[PDB]
């Protein structure tokens, strides 16, 4: 239930790095984390041309191809599996957008699937990630902004933390968090938390 | 309006061959036609695991990769653009299926797009193809079976044919039609009709 499709515990425990991807209706963000829990890259971008009343596959292709052209190679690419269902009609536009994004990411990031048939793109249960970080109110999630801010601006550093930021990147990551803090880019926070949760729940059991 | 995205007229007139793809909820079909209007290939899928209750991107990736592995190369891959609107909540399961199919076909059949940004997958308006073959009664499109039967079994030979079946293949295409005459095989008919309409409306003017 946590991860789909089903990957052998062997390939999961031997991961060297993942790219965790989270998107909304307006923005997308991703984080590259290695098995040392080091944040090798962490980016967000406002894909403002999407979700403007039309569902043009050609525009989705241009946007998603541009997004992934900035991603380094990783063992797995992890997307959110949300709680949206077909029964609610008022959420149809969002659900359709999410499935198109997910479909092209599955297709474009599985660069060798046609030759080896091994899945590299996974969907991770967002509700389970929310419970893991105690971000739930009711059965929905609250913001992980404050929890990410703790990781990024904690003072102690006298015990092994749950996530590491390199020295060359920590200055940029902090300027990125503060410059986008007023806009509250939830996808940026959620991509980091999903990557941490992937290692804590699926790699280092 | 007829074709999306917009393609330079230079590329359209220079087409050597196309793959015309039409899918429903149960089957997919395609036709490979060159600029001499020769049916180089024409076939349909049997049965797939899609549209059986769930929408799994991993399952769509597996099914569509298998379908594409049977297709030859072509200059363009033309998909149907239907009139289903997100405003019509009753059809969202089918609309979701169609958009996932389209998104992965756009992603997987654009093997060079990531380098040059030249679209090779196009969406052709189904209603316009309907009007071109005078199949419309009101705003609904009737079956093209009679047209295709006429194209495959025309023994008068007093008009310039609009499509040509090669000799090593015309035997197989006729027994394909007769074995499928007793079943719902509209995708097979529509894939051929869409290929012809593409040449008559976009290539030769």
Curated annotation (Swiss-Prot), chains A, B:
Recall the GO molecular function terms of this protein's record: DNA polymerase processivity factor activity; RNA binding; transcription elongation factor activity
Q: Does the keyword Transcription regulation apply?
A: yes
Query: Mind telling me which GO cellular component terms the entry cites?
Result: mitochondrial matrix; mitochondrial nucleoid; mitochondrion; ribonucleoprotein complex
Q: Which GO terms describe its biological process?
A: mitochondrial transcription; positive regulation of mitochondrial transcription; regulation of oxidative phosphorylation; transcription elongation by mitochondrial RNA polymerase
- Known outcome of mutating residue 7 to K: In COXPD58; likely pathogenic; decreased DNA polymerase processivity factor activity
Q: Which UniProt keywords apply?
A: Disease variant, Mitochondrion, Mitochondrion nucleoid, Primary mitochondrial disease, Transcription, Transcription regulation, Transit peptide
Localization terms from the record: Mitochondrion matrix; Mitochondrion matrix, Mitochondrion nucleoid
The UniProt family comment states: Belongs to the TEFM family.
State the disease linkage annotated in the record.
Answer: Combined oxidative phosphorylation deficiency 58: An autosomal recessive mitochondrial disease manifesting in the first 5 years of life and characterized by a wide range of clinical presentations. Clinical features include neonatal lactic acidosis, epileptic encephalopathy, developmental delay and impaired intellectual development with non-specific brain abnormalities, or mitochondrial myopathy with a treatable neuromuscular transmission defect.
Q: What does this protein do?
A: Transcription elongation factor which increases mitochondrial RNA polymerase processivity. Regulates transcription of the mitochondrial genome, including genes important for the oxidative phosphorylation machinery.
Q: How does it assemble?
A: Interacts with POLRMT.
Protein's recorded name: Transcription elongation factor, mitochondrial
In the UniProt record, the gene name given for this protein reads TEFM
Q: Which residues of the full protein are shown?
A: 153 to 357 of 360
């Amino acid at each position: 239930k946590l991860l789909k499709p089903d990957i052998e515990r062997e390939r999961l425990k031997a991961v060297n790095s993942i790219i965790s991807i989270v998107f909304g209706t307006r923005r997308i963000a991703w984080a590259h984390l290695d098995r040392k829990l080091t944040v090798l890259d962490w980016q967000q971008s406002d894909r403002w041309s999407l979700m403007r009343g039309i569902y043009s596959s050609s525009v989705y292709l241009e946007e998603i191809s541009s997004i992934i052209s900035k991603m380094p190679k990783a063992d797995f690419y992890v997307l959110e599996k949300t709680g949206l269902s077909i029964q609610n009609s008022s959420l149809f536009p969002i659900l359709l957008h999410f499935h198109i994004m997910e479909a092209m990411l599955y297709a474009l990031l599985n660069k060798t699937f046609a030759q080896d048939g091994q899945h590299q793109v996974l969907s991770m249960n967002r509700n389970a990630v929310g419970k893991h970080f105690e971000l739930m109110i009711g059965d929905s999630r609250t913001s992980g902004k404050e929890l990410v801010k703790q990781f990024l601006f904690d003072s102690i550093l006298k015990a092994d933390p749950r996530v590491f930021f390199p020295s060359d990147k920590i200055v940029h990551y902090r300027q990125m968090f503060l410059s986008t803090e007023l806009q509250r880019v939830e996808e940026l926070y959620d991509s980091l938390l999903q990557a941490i949760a992937f290692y804590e729940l699926a790699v280092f059991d």
